[PDB]
Write a protein that binds this ligand. Structure first.
Ligand SMILES: OC[C@H]1O[C@@H](O[C@@H]2[C@@H](O)[C@@H](O)O[C@H](CO)[C@@H]2O)[C@H](O)[C@@H](O)[C@H]1O
Ligand SMILES: OC[C@H]1O[C@@H](O[C@@H]2[C@@H](O)[C@@H](O)O[C@H](CO)[C@@H]2O)[C@H](O)[C@@H](O)[C@H]1O
Ligand SMILES: OC[C@H]1O[C@@H](O[C@@H]2[C@@H](O)[C@@H](O)O[C@H](CO)[C@@H]2O)[C@H](O)[C@@H](O)[C@H]1O
Ligand SMILES: OC[C@H]1O[C@@H](O[C@@H]2[C@@H](O)[C@@H](O)O[C@H](CO)[C@@H]2O)[C@H](O)[C@@H](O)[C@H]1O
Ligand SMILES: [Ca+2]
Ligand SMILES: [Ca+2]
Ligand SMILES: [Ca+2]
Ligand SMILES: [Ca+2]
Ligand SMILES: [Mn+2]
Ligand SMILES: [Mn+2]
Ligand SMILES: [Mn+2]
Ligand SMILES: [Mn+2]
Lengths: 232, 232, 232, 232
């Protein structure tokens, strides 16, 4: 079988295994900071440098994958804590949308909320133009920040959050488990056909953004990933 | 929210936090050995002593859970490497079936292969009486060892295996991700209505078994767990 | 620190994690066949798609690495069994030398035998023009196929060979263990200052070649690898 | 030439191939446990019964060798995690130092920290009496636990470590590659003249020890080895 697996305990600029897009920066503690606290409509994204083959046009098979990561969002003065973080999957040529206004687009869609991607978002502001739930939430996105499904969640300022995701190729289920700082877990699952919504080659990463009045610290602290694709 | 969580980097008989049933034993290295290599039709199980409330007859809500554990299986001359380990959920009064014949029942069912439980099996022998697949496999079981669904796997003697399990109550989906020695992951998912198959309070645990000629080492190395029930 | 690692039990055409150069090909059994038995001066190379930082100009630190792979060379009528395989390290922009005549250059050098790389060769033909020993041999090469050092070895047709390489940055020592067919091991060590011979970013890989009358099957069966660069 | 190779996926007492000394013991899982968690100043060692001829007084030739092994060290309440494991080579009549205080002596040296042996230590406690580095480390010892050289390492409790060692007789270099739970590899090499420090025949093995307020589980899980000496 064909397998891709890596494990970043910390990060560093200069590491060829990571592509940085937008206002991304690396703190001396090894943490990746996605947004610029002084830029309007700031957008920052990080991607696993190497493209990943999630399905084969020859066999018709689709890969399964186990991945885990931890992040943090902390408030600042005197901006509104926004907008959130999103773990996404997209075409290997994925780039920050042109004229991106950040905000609720999470740096992955256009102003209308559309884009070519699949991801799990950790939304901390309610953008009605995207039909967001009234409170903080985790959501499953398929080519849109207007989630196919969401679940109530709470973003604690300065809290270290852990996430684990499993994509069972056979059932096409994308399962997400979120462990908050206080110990409780929040989950959300949804059938998503990666073969129908994405190309054979893709890139995984994280993206975050803010607006003029909405800003906050967005940090990625760790990330492990393992995908396996059956060749016969 | 009603949350239950714990972590074991090692175990030890003497810690009431765990029930010890059957031939189970705890090795000086903190490993839980499930079966007795010298016994015939051996059966050993271990349970987290505190019963977990998976659903409320009050709210009608079902809990979600994220659990991870590592185990190890190793061959021993001159017996056929059987029968395997099963991670199960069952009534809080669960006990090894009366007059258990071990072997393919994995220590959780009667001879016909029936019992009261829900679990994930890591089967290493092909019992035809239970409709097992030709090779080693991971299966989702509901009240029977005649798995509801299975995926081809391979048990490597001496190899330390990791497993992550997610149960999303809303979609009633159980997701399993097994990390193999060669590096590949293997997944299997299945919709299982816990609230319809198990009582309000249950006990989580592990079980393993052998027969006259089928025997091997079954070890549980570690195990973390977290369940959250919405009480609103 | 910064680490790159992987493990290939088999290969496949299409995996974006690998760069194919020249007459390389992938067999139905997963093996990588480096040369084309019908071409004159055939040359095929395979490199890990992602660049590895073996040293940092900012800190001055040099990474260490551990790697193991297995290959097979099989005779074919009526050509002379040549020319062999070389595990090498080169700048990330590496390509098969323009106008390569294959043969004794092993696909990494020009006619005089010079080039920009570091590698371990498993030579099965004596090219007097490159001061080769009279018999088959394993050699440490630094910017030339005129080995810095060699040790007598023997290529057994159809035999699977296991190789282990360790690079200790502190002593700049490159150690090689080779597992013959008859069970014996052969070793060779040489001090090579990578920080002095190569750029910060390089690629790792294999290469094989042939001439008009010299041809043989060159197969790479497996490959694991891990290198770590201290970022402090 | 003259070769000696073996491989252990599991060991057992009552097996000729291996010698046991001190508090050694073999757990049901085939693992070797060196130090006894109960006794004070415990010391356990294991040796490959058949002595190996590393050099010839007739030719002057010295053998080369490649050996790999995995081990596990795990904490225990409420003792200190010490002292470590050491892979060593010594005269065929080697025995545990008379009136051994175990502990920082690793079971191979005397109180002053001296003995007849060459080895690679995996140290988890810093003994000032032997000039140890401030943190955990891997060291190359030559007739003394006051390492000829050391490298910063980190022993992770409950984790499995894979070790690779190459000895190139020609350059007299000993190279060590050690695994890390975080995916990082560590290396250390040192020129060691075996012929000068050891007799023609020796024994390879493992040794571990504990003190009064310092104990921990020391396990040897597997061990393969191959040495070849030219006899002409
Ligand atoms: O408060 C946070 C929230 O801001 C929205 O942006 C508005 C922007 O359109 C305009 O009206 O100016 C105000 C304050 O100057 C806000 O910046 C975003 O659309 C949301 O995504 C979120 O950042
Ligand atoms: O070989 C392994 C396998 O054994 C079956 O048990 C049989 C038992 O009925 C009787 O015939 O004796 C033989 C001895 O060779 C076996 O022990 C189990 O039914 C299987 O589950 C598995 O253990
Ligand atoms: O026999 C193998 C050997 O061949 C050399 O190449 C010669 C080539 O120069 C010319 O003389 O033609 C013959 C056969 O007709 C060979 O192809 C290579 O230089 C060696 O490296 C090796 O392949
Ligand atoms: O804590 C571990 C460490 O113990 C040292 O042993 C001392 C012993 O001599 C005496 O002073 O009592 C104390 C108790 O606090 C320790 O047991 C060893 O010298 C070290 O090698 C290591 O085992
Ligand atoms: Ca929003
Ligand atoms: Ca079975
Ligand atoms: Ca040659
Ligand atoms: Ca010490
Ligand atoms: Mn949203
Ligand atoms: Mn089964
Ligand atoms: Mn040569
Ligand atoms: Mn030391």
């Amino acid at each position: 079988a064909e397998t891709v697996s890596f494990n970043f305990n910390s990060f560093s600029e200069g590491n060829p295994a990571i592509n940085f897009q937008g206002d991304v920066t690396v703190l001396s503690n090894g943490n990746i900071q996605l947004t610029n606290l002084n830029k309007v409509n700031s957008v920052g994204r990080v991607l696993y440098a190497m493209p990943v083959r999630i399905w084969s046009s020859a066999t018709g098979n689709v890969a399964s994958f186990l991945t885990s990561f931890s992040f943090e969002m902390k408030d600042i003065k005197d901006y509104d804590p926004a907008d959130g973080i999103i773990f996404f999957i997209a075409p290997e040529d994925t780039q920050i949308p042109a004229g991106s206004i950040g905000g609720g687009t999470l740096g992955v869609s256009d102003t209308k909320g559309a884009g070519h991607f699949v991801g799990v978002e950790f939304d901390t502001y309610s953008n009605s133009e995207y039909n967001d739930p009234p409170t903080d939430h985790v959501g499953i996105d398929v080519n849109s920040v207007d989630s196919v499904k969401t679940v109530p969640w709470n973003s604690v300022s300065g809290a270290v959050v852990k996430v684990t995701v499993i994509y069972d190729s056979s059932t096409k289920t994308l399962s997400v488990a979120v462990t908050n700082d206080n110990g409780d877990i929040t989950t959300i699952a949804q059938v998503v056909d990666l073969k129908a919504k994405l190309p054979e080659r893709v890139k995984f990463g994280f993206s975050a953004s803010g607006s003029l009045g909405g800003r906050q610290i967005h940090l990625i602290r760790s990330w492990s990933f393992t995908s396996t694709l059956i060749t016969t």
